[PDB]
Design a protein around this ligand. Structure first.
Ligand code: HEM
Ligand SMILES: CC(C)CC[C@@H](O)[C@](C)(O)[C@H]1CC[C@H]2[C@@H]3CC=C4C[C@@H](O)CC[C@]4(C)[C@H]3CC[C@]12C
Ligand code: FES
Lengths: 470, 28
């Protein structure tokens, strides 16, 4: 059993490692840094970047061992600029920035309202209403274009879509972000979210002491972005709280996540509002970029697009129109979302701090070490996925359940997987049902679109789609 | 056992059940 120090490594100097990382690859290509590192060191390595050292793994078999020894209250890497903002400006923290018993308490509360089948079944008509309106927007744009046809970059529209969707299941109220004339304050919120992520990157491998010193301007801009996030989340929650007392009726119809938490949960109001803030901010840039990638992948692979349409048409007929029923009848659609997140993870890595010592690849890794699963590098790895550059949803249907062992990692694992996983799955699946029924998707002068690291992974450049009424 | 508490948000014990299983339920 080899000691920790024997794990392949660029070296022990974190600032030198950081220097070589910045000059050769760059901060916005961290996902490539991982790929190259694995090609250089083999299937496991350690790297100190600035002050933080991680062990990095790629093999689903090492992944399984990692998540096997996970404790009751797991911890992932905390993003230093995010943590500092919350501490210094004393903002209430949600489930994302809590650990141990305080994390569990929020998570358990939130799980009853956000992850539980009994609760999540209520999301269906709320998300469908938004998706149906998105389809209307595009139909309007086709009519207006006068060519039976619409071409355009719909990123901003996908951000507005994702925002209507998360706000609708939380508040049970439409924000009108899919209308022709849009709330400019709600837009200012949507933009702050992207700014928060983008401005995170120059500060990523530095202790807070070095932020204000070498990234003063970035820190300033980062703080302004979180201020918008928090201001408007507070206003939303607070208005909701008072309007509840103004209309005070024990409604029998479903009204949204917030109503349920405020009316019957163990959480304090301040805890609730902290988590409303995080769920809102978490929901805008994640589902939107993933859908964009999906549409891109359907445009790149027209046969696969044809198959998915046929599945959804069959499913709408077989279910005689009912959405709840449809969702149990689209296994290829669900697999295609899994296939989209493999090629295009939102999260470059998953991370866990070990609670106990652990052996991986005959190396001894001591308790409290950060271990990172290189999710991006994994999905591109030709030894772990057959023909990895090919978008093939059937891959997830294979009854050879050796082929999918610890491969579906886009939303993470165990008790501290994505909190918004059901919202995201349901929102994207419903979004794609509606699109597939209404439009054929193409990209004129199609080319390979790469990935940039903006804390979340995002496309490197715009994608201009063409839509045809089906 | 039952760490997420009967919510289908772990695997310490449908299409979503299938996903929790390919990483190895009692509460469903
Ligand atoms: C395609 C969409 C999404 C992807 C791929 C994604 C991915 C992830 C990943 C990889 C994690 C870390 C899981 C782990 O450490 O094991 C995570 C956590 C988290 N996500 Fe998402 N996410 C998505 C959408 C959302 C949405 C819509 C929300 C809003 C509800 C959200 C809110 C959160 C929160 C609060 C956490 C931290 C949970 C905790 O620490 O208990 N995410 N997500
Ligand atoms: C706005 C927030 C309140 C919610 C954001 C949340 O909805 C995200 C986008 O879902 C967050 C939650 C945990 C985040 C990850 C935590 C740790 C790391 C390691 C770091 O090296 C790269 C970023 C990466 C891989 C983060 C990417 C963005 C994630 C995956
Ligand atoms: S208890 Fe979490 S999955 Fe059944």
């Amino acid at each position: 059993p080899r000691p920790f120090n024997e794990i392949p490594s660029p070296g022990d100097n974190g600032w030198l490692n950081l220097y070589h990382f910045w000059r050769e690859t760059g901060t916005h290509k961290v996902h490539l840094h991982h790929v190259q590192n694995f090609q250089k060191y083999g299937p496991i390595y350690r790297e100190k970047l600035g002050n933080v050292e991680s062990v990095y793994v790629i093999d689903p078999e090492d992944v399984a061992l990692l998540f096997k020894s996970e404790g009751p209250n797991p911890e992932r890497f905390l993003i230093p600029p995010w943590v500092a903002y919350h501490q210094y400006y004393q903002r209430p923290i949600g489930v994302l920035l809590k650990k141990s018993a305080a994390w569990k308490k929020d998570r358990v509360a939130l799980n009853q309202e956000v992850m539980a089948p009994e609760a999540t079944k209520n999301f269906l008509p709320l998300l469908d209403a938004v998706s149906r309106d998105f389809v209307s927007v595009l139909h309007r744009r086709i009519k207006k274009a006068g060519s039976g046809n619409y071409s355009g970059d719909i990123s901003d529209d996908l951000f507005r879509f994702a925002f209507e969707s998360i706000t609708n299941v939380i508040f049970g109220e439409r924000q009108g972000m899919l209308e022709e004339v849009v709330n400019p304050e709600a837009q200012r919120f949507i933009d702050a979210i992207y700014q928060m992520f983008h401005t995170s990157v120059p500060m990523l491998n530095l202790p807070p002491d070095l932020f204000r010193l070498f990234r003063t301007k970035t820190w300033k801009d980062h703080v302004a972005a979180w201020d918008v996030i928090f201001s408007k989340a507070d206003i939303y929650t607070q208005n909701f709280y008072w309007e509840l007392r103004q209309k005070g009726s024990v409604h029998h119809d479903y009204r949204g996540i917030l109503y349920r938490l405020l009316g019957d949960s163990k959480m304090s109001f301040e805890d609730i509002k902290a988590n409303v803030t995080e769920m809102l901010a978490g929901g805008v840039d994640t589902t939107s970029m993933t859908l964009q990638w999906h549409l891109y992948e359907m445009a790149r692979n027209l046969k696969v697009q044809d198959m998915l349409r046929a599945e959804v048409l069959a499913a709408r007929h077989q279910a005689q129109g009912d959405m709840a029923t449809m969702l149990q009848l689209v296994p290829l659609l669900k697999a295609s979302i899994k296939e989209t997140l493999r090629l295009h993870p939102i999260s470059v890595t998953l991370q866990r701090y070990l609670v106990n010592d652990l052996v991986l690849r005959d190396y001894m890794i001591p308790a409290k070490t950060l271990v990172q699963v290189a999710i991006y590098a994994l999905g591109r790895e030709p030894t772990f996925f057959f023909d990895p550059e090919n978008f093939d949803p059937t891959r997830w249907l294979s009854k050879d359940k050796n082929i999918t062992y610890f491969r579906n990692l886009g939303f993470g694992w165990g008790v501290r997987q994505c909190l918004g996983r059901r919202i995201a799955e349901l929102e994207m699946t419903i979004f794609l049902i509606n699109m597939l029924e209404n439009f054929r998707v193409e990209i004129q002068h199609l080319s390979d679109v790469g990935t940039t690291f903006n804390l979340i992974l995002m496309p490197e450049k715009p994608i201009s789609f063409t839509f045809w009424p089906f | 056992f039952g760490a997420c508490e009967g919510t289908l948000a772990c695997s310490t014990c449908t299409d979503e059940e299938n996903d929790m299983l390919d990483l190895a339920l009692g509460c469903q």
